[PDB]
Symmetry: C2
């Protein structure tokens, strides 16, 4: 949930997942940085296609957070924010009210939660002989995409300078563009799910 | 030195450094992947320019190894190799003969050794009022560049598929190209220092 208005032990720890098979200033920096597979194939299963890409998107965000993880600590980022207009909250026990947490605690919990869904055989069948549950796209895929977006939002609004230092602007913008086009093709994310990055999506998408 | 012919605890650990201030198959995969600041500025000090870029190159290699580190363990890569024609060795105590070690042990030792040179005030002055030692370029910069190259060699020859999975082919090729052009401009590396990547350098450089 969304609230709209030298210690290293507690930074985000990356983990790769095995394959399934103000805002105006921020956006101008993003576009200026550049100067320095979406459709379901015919005969292919939609759930499988969406499952494949959901694990792939997790892995791109894992690689991108991992590149800057030493710059995001509970002292640099005491709240999970995407500018001062958006704060994102985490519920530690399911069905309980979400709370304010530092950005790396948030990212850690969220990413480990995604891996727990990928690793759950009743959600993501790990054999050819398994099936997907009813409501898979709405009940599993959509919540995962909505949450992974919040990680992109924190990176762009609070760590873009570091991404630029490492020359990862094009990899970041390419991943995000593919994430947003994929969500559009299947109506997984709507304009409101983009929060502070709406203009970015308007520019990058096309 | 050069010899020419589920446990996770022992993979390479990344650490960012604060800013100073067969082979034919491998090369064709590299070029096909693409379809899916060098001169000293006027009035500027050469030692400073080379010191700045040496820490920057370390940081690009750190980010690139970090992206694939879970795929390089003492079981996947029991020797530090760049194809079966080149094995690179590490001396654990200075002045002693270098030995065979696993790739991630090698990379760990080498990168931590680079940081120890960057952090040594008598080599890399950490204030405006320090000076560089005599022989800086030959005795400090050149050995560091020669060693960092061996890390690029292992990545290209043994982990390129994983770099491709993460869409980092262009970032890898861009870093390596800039590394090789920088070495050419100042004669830091010679054609022999490139070992198995000579053809790659021939294609990428220009
Ligand atoms: Zn942060
Ligand atoms: Zn390896």
């Amino acid at each position: 949930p969304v609230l709209t208005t030298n210690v290293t032990d507690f930074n985000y720890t990356p983990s790769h997942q095995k394959p399934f098979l103000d805002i105006k200033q921020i956006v101008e920096m993003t576009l200026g940085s550049e100067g320095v597979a979406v459709k379901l194939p015919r005969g292919e299963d939609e759930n499988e296609w969406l499952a494949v890409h959901c694990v792939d998107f997790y892995n791109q965000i894992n690689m991108l957070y991992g590149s800057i993880t030493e710059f995001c600590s509970p002292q640099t980022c005491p709240r999970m924010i995407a500018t001062n207009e958006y704060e994102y909250l985490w519920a530690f026990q399911k069905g309980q009210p979400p709370v304010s947490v530092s950005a790396p605690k948030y990212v850690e919990c969220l990413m480990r939660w995604c891996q727990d869904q990928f690793d759950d055989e009743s959600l993501f069948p790990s054999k050819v002989t398994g099936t997907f549950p009813e409501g898979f796209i709405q009940r599993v895929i959509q919540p995962i995409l909505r949450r992974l977006f919040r990680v992109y939002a924190h990176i762009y609004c609070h760590h873009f300078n570091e991404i630029l230092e490492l020359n990862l602007q094009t990899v970041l913008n390419t991943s995000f563009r593919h994430f947003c086009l994929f969500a559009q093709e299947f109506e997984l994310l709507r304009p409101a799910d983009f929060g502070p990055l709406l203009e970015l999506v308007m520019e990058l998408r096309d």
